[PDB]
Design a binder for this molecule. Structure first.
Ligand code: 1NY
Ligand code: 1NY
Lengths: 11, 240, 239, 11
């Protein structure tokens, strides 16, 4: 649901 | 006997002092620079200042994510919890950071690019009716003489909190938080030897941040309604 | 007879006492219910508002009496006494009502004994904050806080050197220091089993400030919802 | 300009 926060947290 | 041995917590304390320093440049380590934009008087909103403020806020949030992932155990939590912790504590840390960049003599605040705005310009940039309140908080930190190590731990304690709503493994978060509390309690002790009352005094600053970030959430909504464009996507994701 | 220990115990007892004699325990109240809008949420139940705000007003009066019993409080300037009271009003109103929570019935009990369910709390005025407040009441129950802890927690919220527009922040700030110590010592003396309980309990004030900030916003919304003015004392506290 | 809180203070 959170595109950015999730991409930054994946790597 | 003077201080006992605490090898692990000394190490943890360093791993956090480093994460903070390397995701947030110190005031002395910055090349300040001012602007003439609406420096004289308070206005509703200076778009020029907002544009730069919003941009710098975005970047700081990116730094905060980075700082979080560098916290031992954080990347251990589920992606859902990591997001939950960040969203709840993001504003608290944004406040804490800009307030540790306060220069009391010029009454200004300094961003990570060196941009230095005065009380009026901070208001005009987006602080609005929360200006004097945040500046008051800044002045209240000074007597505490916090360093990078204490600011990093306080930030980590703020983020790593097992009370947040919707935490999948809140008890797992609790586990990660307590060594941070012990780490702070001890570091303050060695640093400020027989000058105590300081641990609870510093810890209670989270109380102050929480109050401000709560009003801050409403300020963001009023700004969302005030600015011509959209609120930067990363910002909306942190406040949603 | 170490000196500071004696002074801190003295401070502790005095605050436990001030709390008990200005705020009855849930177990010692004669509970009674009402049927007003108990089954469904509405924007505002004017009848519940009246009773609610009346009880709140009477609690605010108790809160004032509690402050006046806090060591050094009447030693502050008049303006600062007023200022501290206003900035801590919601904090203590929240804390107090959340310690009167009963988990089975999902209710909160006022000091006259009145017991309302979650829906009636909402309809009385809590509105959109209802669930937030109840959630905090649940996280609080396991702490098993007593009058000494709750009273010290209230004293700490009240004697806060970081409030806006204080004339003598330093004096207030130093006045708070022994409160923090008494709490730590009491918690440790009372809960040797669980360490780190001092930060845990102490930081529930974080929740209070958060809800209180929202609270002040809630009150503005109510001002335009209620077909009349709020009780004058509440008006003054919320200014 | 309320007078209640002050009157309550003075007891
Ligand atoms: C709560 C308050 C006082 C007002 C609301 C803020 C805000 C957040 C998102 C959008 C618009 C306003 C807001 C934003 C910040 C903020 O971005 N802080 C910050 C900004 C940049 C930096 C940096 O460059 O190092 C450090 C800290 C700090 C304080 C707040
Ligand atoms: C902030 C919140 C969550 C919602 C706003 C309240 C309120 C305060 C003043 C005017 C209108 C609403 C509000 C009021 C109270 C409140 O009046 N608490 C309270 C009232 C009475 C008693 C008592 O009889 O023992 C105990 C606690 C508690 C919580 C709040």
């Amino acid at each position: 649901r959170h595109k950015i926060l999730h991409r930054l947290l994946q790597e | 006997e003077s201080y006992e041995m605490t090898a692990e917590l000394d190490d943890l304390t360093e791993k956090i002092r480093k994460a903070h320093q390397e995701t947030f440049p110190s005031l002395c380590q910055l090349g300040k620079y001012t602007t003439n934009s609406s420096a004289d008087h308070r206005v509703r909103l200076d778009l020029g200042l907002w544009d730069k403020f919003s941009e710098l806020a975005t970047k700081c949030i990116i730094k905060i994510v980075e700082f979080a992932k560098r916290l031992p155990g954080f990347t251990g939590l589920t992606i859902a919890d990591q997001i939950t912790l960040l969203k709840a504590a993001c504003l608290d840390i944004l406040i804490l950071r800009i307030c540790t960049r306060y220069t009391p003599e010029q009454d200004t605040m300094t961003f990570s690019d060196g941009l230095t705005l005065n009380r009026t310009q901070m208001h005009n940039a987006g602080f609005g009716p929360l200006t004097d309140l945040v500046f008051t908080f800044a002045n209240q930190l000074l007597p505490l003489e916090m360093d990078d190590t204490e600011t990093g731990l306080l930030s980590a304690i703020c983020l790593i909190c097992g009370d947040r709503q919707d935490l999948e493994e809140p008890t797992k978060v609790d586990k990660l938080q307590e060594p941070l509390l012990e780490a702070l309690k001890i570091y303050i002790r060695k640093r400020r030897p027989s000058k105590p009352h300081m641990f609870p005094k510093i810890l209670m600053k989270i109380t102050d941040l929480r109050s401000i970030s709560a009003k801050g959430a409403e300020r963001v909504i009023t700004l969302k309604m005030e600015i011509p464009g959209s609120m930067p996507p990363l910002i909306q994701e942190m406040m949603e």
